[PDB]
Each structure stands twice: as C-alpha cells, then as structure tokens.
C-alpha cells in the first residue's frame, strides 16, 4: 500500500481512458474555468527561470 498509493491516486483522479480505437475524454467544469486562469505552461516557465539560473552567471 506504500508502493502504489500514488498509483491508485492518479489512476482514480485521471480521466480520458481508452476504449479500443477510441478515447473517452471528460469535459471540464465551468466552476474551475470561471474561478481561475489556466495553469502556466511549465515548458516556458522552466525555460525562463532556467535561463536566469544558467551556469554562465555564477550564482551562489
């Protein structure tokens, strides 16, 4: 139960499972889509802060 708690957490939380040739996506809620702006794209946020913490400027 210690080695699969994150597995059963993610496998019960996540959606859009496969059905043969198909894939059954959930539509989201107006609750979240009208309470919050969407999440940041971690690719570009990691690009910007990884640039500002590149090795060529010797941080310490």
């Amino acid at each position: 139960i210690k080695t699969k708690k994150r597995k059963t957490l993610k496998n019960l939380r996540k959606d859009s499972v496969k059905r043969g040739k198909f894939r059954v996506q959930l539509l989201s809620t107006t609750q979240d889509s009208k309470t919050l702006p969407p999440k940041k794209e971690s690719s570009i946020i990691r690009s910007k802060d990884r640039w500002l913490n590149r090795k060529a400027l010797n941080k310490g």
Binding site: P37, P38, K40, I44
Partner: protein
C-alpha cells in the same frame, strides 16, 4: 487594499492597467498560458479569460489611449486585442506579421507603432496604425551586440517619448538607445554584469532606470541642457539595494509623489525616489504585511491553525506538536479560515466555495471528517467569524451577509 489569489500551478508574468477617462479601472494579466485574464476588481475573480488565438503569451502591453492590447507570444506572433468595447468584452483585432523567435517584450510608440524585443537578439518594429498601407507588417529590425558564448535575448524594451528613442536591455547586460526614425543605435552602455530584466523611465524622460539579475539598479540621465540639446544619455549612477534579483520595476511621478518601485526574486518591495535616486533614501518593505491573516489560535487545547496555499496545519503548545493537517487537493486555491471556540469545527473558505470539517482529538493526532452542506459548498466566502459554537456569519464576495447554522439587511452606499 485587496488581494486576488490564484491557485495551484498558476503564475502571473505581466499585468497592465487600463483606465479610459470616465470609466472604471480595468486590470488585465497574462499567466504562463495562452489566455489573457481580465479581472473585475470587486469580487477578486476573473471576469474574462480571453484565449488569445496564437500560442503561449510571453508579454503584454497596453496601447497609449488604452483601446488596444498587445500580447506577444511564443510562436513569434504579436496579437492585437480590441479593448474598447466596454469593461469585460474583448475582441480579436489583428495578428501582426509573424516571425520565428518568440517576442519577449512589447511596447507601443503611440497609437501608431509597436516595438518588440525577441529571443533571437533582435528588436522588431511593427506598425499597428490601422488604415495605412503598411498596417501589421514589421517595418524595421535591429540587432543587439550578441554574447560570444551563449544566445542573446532582448528582455526589456521601452519607448521614450520626449526624445524619439527606444531603450532596450538585453541578456548581455548592455543597454542600448535607438533612434526610432532611422531605426538605429545612438549609444550603447555596457552596464550590468548579467541580464537586464526590466527598465523604465520617468515622465519627461530625463532618466532611465534599469535592473536585472545582477541585482543592481542603474540610472541613465539626460537632465543637462547640453544632454538634451545633444541627445546624449550618461551612465549617471548605480545602486545595490536588492538581495537576489529585480524582475519588475516601475515609476510614478506626480506633484506629491515621485518614486520608482522595484521587486524581484527576494520577495520584498523597494521604494526609491525618481529625481533623487542616488542621493535620496529608500524603503525596503517587509516581505509580508498580513492585512489578510493566515494564522489563528484557539485558547482551548492551546492550539494554532495556519494555512498556506491549499493546505492547513494545526499544532499545539505543551514545546509544541503538530497534531493534524489538511492538504485538501480537491481544492486549488485557499483563502480565509476560522475555528469554532471549543476547537470543534474548522471552516476553510475561498471565493469559489467553502468547506467545514469536524475535528476530534484522538490523543497525539486528530480525526477530521467533512460535514456536508451544499449551501456552504455553493456559496462564495470571504470572512467566517462564528457567532456561536454553531452559528457563523458569512460575508460573500458579492456583498452578501448570511448567518448559517440567514440574511442581514444592508443599506446601500452613495456611488
């Protein structure tokens, strides 16, 4: 005055105001995503999530006269958003002429031109002047002095209206001033030791202040009559005030207020004087001034609850011992919280919902159970303050004052 919180994995990279004279203030902000988010200042919620129709937004700027909005995106696009339709309604206007590299900073000349610094080391100039022949196409391109051993990114671009220049800070630390007509460099300073993330100017453009990851704020001055008649900035001064970085800088200047405000990776704000930067004094704000609290105690059981983003924690005095915590991840954002006197029921509450949890001290631990109430699950809560062990009073984000476990008459105010 107010705080508008966002939730899990939400950030905010740029934000711009808009106040057409006679109408309400309007506040737009980009996150790390494909939308612009306009907030209504009353509730503290987004009233509009306009998905910009091209890529991930890297920068935002507002037109002079504030009827249009530039968003500069990761796929090299500059998208114009028509703002003047009223507060809330945003239309797409025009995608300007595309390019390869992402446009990292924007500025407007006037209603006419739009300047943009990109991640290929270049500074493009587009014309956003509607009903011209060259509307939307990029008129000029300028290239800054590249770094020898890494790529160069132009991080900050402003327009200086008293002269006719563009000031630009890039990731070599160099700060360049460019004549707008002829689209060409007048003078380059090798100021900082690393990137120049943000730079700003005063009203009459006698000073340009600039700052970045090497954590000094440089001041470039043109105040002498010979400087104004020769168009020659000098590298006047330089101050070390911040601890880690400066990611944002801005300036305000009025009849009884002239200060530049700056903040960075260290979480504190710093206020300096505009026309008296090197001479005058400065004030480093506290990193938090809790106008909205995140900690409260209850005298019974000698216990204290404290909530950071989307988790609460409870410990008791004795030393001290962490007795329970609630990392509720069905939640995304937290806000204010209160405990019952006798320490029985906690209620956490954000502007979208609220939730109430019975607590039972089982010894060196607690047992916490949700108690369902769909009125609480549907209501927006700012403040909950517990009339009795059962009765609480709820202030809603849309100015409602309920009494649960129903309605206070509340008179209106002169607008």
């Amino acid at each position: 005055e107010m705080v508008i919180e966002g939730g899990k994995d939400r950030s905010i990279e740029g934000l711009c105001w808009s106040n057409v004279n006679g109408e309400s203030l309007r506040l737009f902000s980009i996150g790390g995503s494909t939308v612009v988010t306009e907030w209504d200042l009353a509730t503290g919620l987004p009233l509009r999530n306009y998905d910009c129709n091209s890529g991930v937004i890297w920068s935002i700027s507002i037109n002079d006269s504030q009827d249009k909005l530039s968003v500069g995106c990761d796929n090299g696009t500059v998208v114009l958003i028509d703002i003047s339709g009223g507060p809330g309604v945003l239309e797409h206007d025009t995608i300007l002429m595309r390019q390869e590299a992402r446009v990292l900073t924007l500025a407007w000349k006037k209603d006419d031109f739009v300047i943009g610094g990109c991640s290929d080391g270049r500074i493009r100039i587009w014309s956003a002047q509607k009903n011209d022949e060259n509307m939307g196409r990029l008129l000029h391109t300028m290239k800054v002095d590249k770094a020898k051993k890494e790529s160069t990114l132009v991080w900050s671009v402003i327009y200086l209206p008293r002269t006719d220049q563009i000031a630009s800070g890039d990731s070599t630390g160099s700060i360049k001033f460019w004549d707008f007509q002829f689209a060409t460099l007048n003078q380059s300073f090798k100021a900082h030791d690393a990137d120049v993330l943000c730079l700003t100017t005063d009203t009459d453009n006698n000073y340009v202040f600039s700052a970045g990851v090497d954590r000094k704020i440089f001041q470039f001055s043109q105040n002498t009559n010979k400087s104004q008649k020769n168009n020659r900035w000098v590298n006047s001064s330089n101050r070390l005030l911040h601890g880690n970085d400066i990611r944002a800088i801005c300036a305000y200047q009025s009849k009884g207020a002239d200060f530049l405000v700056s903040g960075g990776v260290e979480k504190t704000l710093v206020i300096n004087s505009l026309t008296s930067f090197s001479n005058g004094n400065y004030r480093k704000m506290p990193t938090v001034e809790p106008y909205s609290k995140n900690v409260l105690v209850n005298k019974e059981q000698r216990l204290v609850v404290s909530w950071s983003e989307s988790t609460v924690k409870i410990w008791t005095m004795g030393n001290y011992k962490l007795v329970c915590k609630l990392t509720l991840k069905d939640d995304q954002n937290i806000s204010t919280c209160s405990l019952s006197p006798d320490g029985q029921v906690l209620v956490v509450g954000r502007p979208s919902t609220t939730k109430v949890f019975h607590l039972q001290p089982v010894g060196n631990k607690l047992k916490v159970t949700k108690l369902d109430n769909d009125l609480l699950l549907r209501t927006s809560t700012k403040l909950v303050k517990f009339i009795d062990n059962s009765k609480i009073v709820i202030c809603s984000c849309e100015d409602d004052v309920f009494i649960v476990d129903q309605e206070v008459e509340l008179l209106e105010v002169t607008s």
